[PDB]
């Protein structure tokens, strides 16, 4: 399913069809993207369960070599990093950075804290490690100077913001899908009816609430105007 | 190698080239 | 040679292409790349004057261990028109149904 | 060991672990660590590669090979006499016998000043990649699978993502298979039982096979007929 | 320039070499120069090696169209080599300039043709077929021999003679 | 039963018969498929039970050989992937890929994560594998080079979308069925009354909700217009 | 021969048909295919001149172990009109009820 | 009629054809009519297609031994086709009448011979060559390449050209080759 | 073993397993893996195929057959004397007796420079596809069925899709059938009991059966009457 | 192209022979 189908299901359940409606489809996109992460955490955080393939998305990143701090000699070895800021993954799925082929290569996505201290094991000196720095970029680290030649990776994970990771979606065979509404929403069908129910409950009450409608330099909500 | 005569003639031609 | 050049260029270009796609190449194969280009500069330098034909035999038969060892190095292809069993296109043309004292004859 | 150590690459264990939907985030990075942990915790000598390498002693000290993990023996290169552990507290320190040695890191402290010594040491069989290479014995593979499974379930149980009964079952299975693997890799073969028998039954005991490289530990002890 | 027949005699006593120059109009000036024979021991990639097995110069036989076609029959025992375990390399040369209208890549003075004895291979195939007759199971040595022969064929047709000799010496001699 | 029977049963229970109705049969189709997936997961995820053949569905796939990353000598061995994207499966049944004869052939369908490290066992080197990659296609991998010759397969599973797998359904003896409404809905009849009840409950309240009827550049929902 | 060619063409066509429907054929059967087309190549080239009739007998009897071994190789069908028990269409034509000195007699 | 040399130059420039009528006196009268070149995309079951790739009438030249033997050195770039990813069909038509008492079947006015660039196929096979050395394993890539080539070979020798096209399309239509440089590489 | 090892194909075990509707998702892959695991864990010597194959030693090293799993013995081709195991640590390493052998991977380390040796080893009976081939002994088939069922139910119980009682029952049944199978395949038959009888009762003990190929191990020991 | 020692020996000897 696509963003369009979910959005218009929510709108039609709410009957927000007129262009002169207070709650636009943008409210629907916001609520859908947040309630998706809410439901996924509620279902896949208590105890470890199988996560379907629908909850995931693949972003494609372009890597650039950057200094550790600045251009000094003693400031440590350089890191690669994605050109643009990367979405934050949830901790419920199977995050994986792969070199444009999911079935090959070993690039390990680890925590920020762990990546401070990796590769000291002599047999793990050739493994590329990944983490999202507080800067918001995906930083790469390894002890094997060959890693700095890496130019492109794809990252598959259950990203915490469907909109961000869908905007960073990888080019399809036909070409890029410009409109977000024509892209595919990241959620299993078994979680779609609950998601629509939660969003529709969220906006049902506000839909029929009064407005401060008189232009009279006055607050008109206490009078239910 | 097994040089032919004509190859030798080429070699001396190019050596006497800088005569 | 002019061919060790081509093989070395191909090998190192493939090496850096892999380091572009992936971020890792086996150092057991970087060893083969090192040996290959070291040999080519050995043979295309001032040290090509110390080689006999026996040394040439040994060098070629040792480099052919690197041929299919990794994807970077390939088996070179030369222009060949031979095979282990050749075709017989000779034609038979006897003289007016004649023979020699023991056998047949032709033109 | 009755069976033979046919070598296979490490991801043969990930062939088998990732059948389990709760172990799908394991990687070769994790496989390497937990496999080395299992190799060391089991301490089976048939898993290591027997190598011999000679070094020179500068002055009661010598450089040690890179891949050494344990030393079977050390001997003098010219005599062949084996060395013993150095009980002495003041070896290379003078004031104002039988040779020995000691090894801590990349340095071996012998009691000889200038000589060449032969070291029979054990290492790890590596792959074309610089990675460990594991036996394909299905007992070993199953026990390593259970080790990695038990560690991962311990983590998930510390998080509260696994029922305690599940972890208890995993630990029970791993314990039984650890005992099974230990016995599989230790119990002698028929050819090794001939060596053990020749060592055991000796009318005139032989108690000096350490001087040699235990060459004659297993030779038969033939008594002449009178 | 090409080969008409390059074969070892069925009696395992002669090595037949019958060379000819191509019939196209612009090899009129081109002739045949020499025949150099090398084995798996004395081969070198860069043309014939030094100390070859047998050199032949074709002016010696004749006293011009006769020189465009040549036929040799070398008693192999006179060459002091084993006819059954020897792989002969037969070089030929031209000593002649073609015209200026030659299409590119056709003007090449030298060629090469590899030779082996098919009798031992025939005997091995017959032996393996005899084995197959008993119980109708394919021996794996037979498939190995077939695939190794195909490997040497590929090496020869691609010009990779070093690895070709390596396979020959490793499998079909020892 | 077909899509038509289920759709029109829901519509007739809602009495959405007038062509001038807000909720069209496409709303019904969307809700039916999403609640199908919801009910199947709710019933067959808690513990393992028997899945009847009615919840299963089949598709026809055409396989094409593709490079792992791109055309390069050192980028790894090639793969076989379906020409078109494959619907996501539900991890509750017996997914199976077969070579057009269900009772023959062994083409294993495994997890995408497992498919990286596979085939190293000497006796598993002639087994063909499958997994739906993040691209969306079903990639194939094996160590026996004969697999690349394979040209056409079928795939049976409890698919996440009944509509997507219905569009990719295998041709029948009579021929292709042009209308989705004339295809068999993939759910057991023991689960149909629950499904109809859930969907009718989804659309009952909205069926009688007010609309923003006036065309006056104003939101008329708070006034119950 | 002209029939080994047909058998081999059928065998490899069936082989690749299976590799089209399936992605696997027994390599114990690929070995038989390999034997078959190796024999086809050898008998239809410059190597057939070493063949005696005993060699032909042995070759045929070894090839017929491949006949019904797989689905790819199949029993060849030749043009035959014989059987283990032939018919008796001779007719009896007695002459003037004439017995001979001991036997009967016909035309 | 028969083929003397039917080949593509290993530099991937020239499609070489060399036809010559049989030297036996039965066929003394018969002469070559035309040379028609077809590809796997312009092939028909019987006779050349009505949209061939190249036509060459022999009689538009010196008109008798020159007529009995003909040779071509067609450059492939003028044909607007790829030397390595193309399989050519060479049709040779004869004009004349063979004298009676020739055994039947020999009097076939038309002859067909195909062409393929085997160098890229050897390039593919070399990748799996070294599997032959490694015992304990089946050289599956080597076997697969050999069988791929021999499928085309046998289907050609039996006249089953359509399945030959199908196999060529399945296997080798995506072959790559180094296009020859127009500036003639100078040597000799 | 009392009974004979008649061989049957792997999918027999899937014919028996898939009768359980909770085991319908098994495949030939899982059957192959768990069948190899079970065969190794039981380690029954009657399931492997005895073979003999001669190799040539180059210099204290030799190439090993591809299908080898365990070596019964190694001997010299010319003399027939069996080789014991190596106790040495410095076998082929010179400085400035009884033959022995040692096997790790595809290589055999013997104490002889240039000789041919015969190796009696055990391998797996393979299928025409090239797959493992299992006995049809219904005790073996039942125990393998229970092994595969136990692994599958362990995985399900880890997800929480199987009751603990069901898994406990499966483990109990598998344990009993494992004991039954071990006794079935190991207890000597009547002829093997004759061999053991001739080996046990010996007025003049024989303690050199290893020098021969254990040929006279079951030979009856006759005493002349006086 | 490639030369060995012997190739140079032949070339130089053949030069000196005809000088």
Swiss-Prot record, chains A, F:
Predominant place of localization: virion
Region Disordered, residue ranges: 206-225
Cysteine-cysteine disulfides: none
GO CC entries: virion component
Highest taxon above the source species: Viruses
Subcellular compartments: Virion
Keywords: Virion
Function: Forms the tail multi-ring barrel with ring protein 1, ring protein 3 and ring protein 4.
Assembly with partners or alone: Homododecamer.
Something else known: The barrel is composed of five stacked dodecameric ring structures. Podoviridae-like phages usually possess only one such ring. The tail is thus rather long.
Name the UniProt record assigns to this protein: Ring protein 2
Swiss-Prot record, chains C, G:
Localization terms from the record: Virion
Keywords carried by this UniProt record: Viral tail protein, Virion
Keyword Glycoprotein: no
GO cellular component: virus tail
Reported function: Forms the tail hub together with tail hub protein A (THA).
Subunit description: Heterotrimer with THA. The heterotrimers further assemble as 12 docking hubs that anchor the trimeric tail fibers.
Protein name: Tail hub protein B
Species of origin: Bacteroides phage crAss001 (Bacteroides phage PhiCrAss001)
Swiss-Prot record, chains D, I:
Pfam families (UniProt xref): CrAss_Ring_1
Domain of life: Viruses
GO cellular component: virus tail
Cellular localisation: Virion
UniProt keyword annotations, A-Z: Viral tail protein, Virion
Major location (coarse): virion
Protein task: Forms the tail multi-ring barrel with ring protein 2, ring protein 3 and ring protein 4.
Oligomer and partners: Homododecamer.
Additional observations: The barrel is composed of five stacked dodecameric ring structures. Podoviridae-like phages usually possess only one such ring. The tail is thus rather long.
Protein name: Ring protein 1
Lineage, opening ranks: Viruses, Duplodnaviria, Heunggongvirae, Uroviricota, Caudoviricetes
From Swiss-Prot, chain H:
Binding partners and assembly: Heterotrimer with THB. The heterotrimers further assemble as 12 docking hubs that anchor the trimeric tail fibers.
Organism, as annotated: Bacteroides phage crAss001 (Bacteroides phage PhiCrAss001)
Residue stretches spanning the membrane: none
Main location as per UniProt: virion
Function summary: Forms the tail hub together with tail hub protein B (THB).
Keyword set, alphabetical order: Viral tail protein, Virion
Highest taxon of source: Viruses
Compartments (UniProt record): Virion
Keyword Lipid biosynthesis tagged: no
Record's protein name: Tail hub protein A
GO CC field: virus tail
Keyword Transmembrane: no
């Amino acid at each position: 399913m696509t963003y369009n189908e979910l959005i218009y299901m929510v709108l039609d359940e709410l009957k927000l069809s007129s262009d002169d409606s207070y709650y636009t489809p943008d409210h629907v996109i916001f609520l859908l993207v947040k309630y998706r992460s809410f439901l996924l955490k509620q279902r896949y955080s208590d105890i470890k369960k199988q996560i379907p393939d629908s909850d995931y998305q693949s972003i494609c990143l372009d890597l650039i070599e950057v200094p550790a701090i600045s251009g000094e000699p003693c400031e440590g070895s350089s890191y690669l990093r994605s050109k643009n800021k990367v979405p934050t993954t949830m901790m419920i799925g199977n995050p994986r950075v792969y070199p444009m082929d999911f079935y090959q290569g070993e690039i390990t996505y680890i925590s920020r804290d762990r990546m401070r201290y990796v590769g000291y094991n002599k047999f793990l000196r050739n493994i590329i490690y990944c983490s999202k720095a507080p800067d918001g970029y995906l930083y790469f680290k390894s002890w094997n100077p060959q890693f700095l030649h890496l130019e492109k990776v794809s990252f598959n994970a259950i990203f915490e913001d469907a909109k961000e990771a869908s905007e960073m979606a990888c080019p399809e065979e036909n070409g890029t899908i410009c409109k977000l509404e024509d892209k595919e929403f990241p959620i299993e069908d078994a979680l779609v009816p609950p998601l629509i129910e939660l969003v529709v409950k969220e906006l049902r009450g506000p839909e029929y609430s009064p407005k401060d409608e008189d232009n009279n330099a006055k607050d008109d909500l206490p009078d239910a105007r | 190698m097994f040089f032919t005569q004509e190859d030798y003639r080429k070699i001396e031609k190019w050596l006497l080239a800088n005569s | 040679m002019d061919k060790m050049l081509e093989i070395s260029e191909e090998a190192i270009t493939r090496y850096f292409t892999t380091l572009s796609q992936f971020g890792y190449k086996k150092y057991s194969d970087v060893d083969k790349i090192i040996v290959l280009f070291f040999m080519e500069e050995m043979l295309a330098g001032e040290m090509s004057y110390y080689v006999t034909q026996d040394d040439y035999r040994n060098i070629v038969n040792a480099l052919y261990c690197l041929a299919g060892s990794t994807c970077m190095i390939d088996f070179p292809m030369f222009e060949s028109y031979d095979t282990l069993v050749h075709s017989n296109n000779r034609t038979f043309v006897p003289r007016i149904t004649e023979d020699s004292i023991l056998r047949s004859t032709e033109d | 060991m009755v069976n033979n150590i046919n070598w296979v690459k490490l991801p043969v264990i990930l062939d088998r672990l990732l059948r389990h939907p709760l172990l799908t985030d394991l990687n070769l990075e994790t496989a390497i660590q937990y496999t080395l942990d299992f190799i060391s915790a089991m301490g089976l000598p048939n898993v290591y590669v027997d190598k011999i390498e000679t070094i020179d002693i500068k002055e009661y000290r010598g450089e040690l090979p890179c891949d050494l993990i344990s030393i079977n023996q050390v001997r003098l290169h010219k005599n062949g006499i084996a060395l013993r552990a150095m009980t002495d507290n003041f070896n290379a320190y003078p004031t104002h016998g039988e040779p020995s040695f000691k090894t801590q890191g990349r340095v071996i402290f012998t009691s000889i000043k200038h000589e060449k010594v032969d070291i029979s040491y054990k290492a790890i069989m590596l792959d074309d990649e610089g990675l460990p290479l594991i036996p394909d014995n299905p007992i070993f593979l199953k026990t390593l699978e259970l080790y990695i499974k038990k560690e991962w379930f311990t983590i998930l149980f510390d998080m509260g993502k696994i029922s305690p009964a599940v972890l208890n079952n995993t630990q029970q299975e791993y314990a039984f298979k650890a005992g099974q693997c230990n016995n599989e890799f230790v119990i002698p073969s028929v050819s090794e039982m001939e060596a053990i028998t020749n060592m055991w039954n000796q009318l005139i005991p032989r108690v000096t096979e350490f001087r040699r490289g235990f060459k004659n530990l297993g030779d038969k002890e033939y008594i002449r007929v009178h | 320039m090409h080969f008409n027949e390059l074969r070892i005699s069925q009696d395992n006593r002669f090595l037949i070499i019958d060379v000819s120059v191509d019939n196209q109009d612009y090899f009129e000036d081109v002739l045949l120069d020499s025949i150099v024979i090398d084995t798996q021991d004395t081969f070198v990639m860069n043309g014939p090696s030094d100390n070859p097995l047998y050199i032949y110069n074709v002016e010696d036989a004749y006293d011009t169209q006769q020189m465009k076609n040549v036929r040799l029959e070398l008693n192999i025992q006179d060459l002091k080599v084993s006819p059954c375990s020897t792989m002969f390399f037969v070089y030929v040369k031209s000593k002649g300039t073609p015209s200026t209208d030659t299409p590119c890549g056709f003007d090449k003075d030298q060629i090469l043709g590899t030779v082996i004895n098919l009798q031992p291979i025939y005997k091995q195939t017959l032996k393996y077929l005899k084995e197959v007759e008993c119980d109708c199971n394919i021996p794996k040595g037979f498939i190995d021999m077939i695939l190794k022969l195909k490997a040497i064929e590929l090496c020869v047709r691609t010009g990779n003679y070093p690895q070709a000799i390596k396979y020959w010496n490793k499998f079909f001699i020892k």
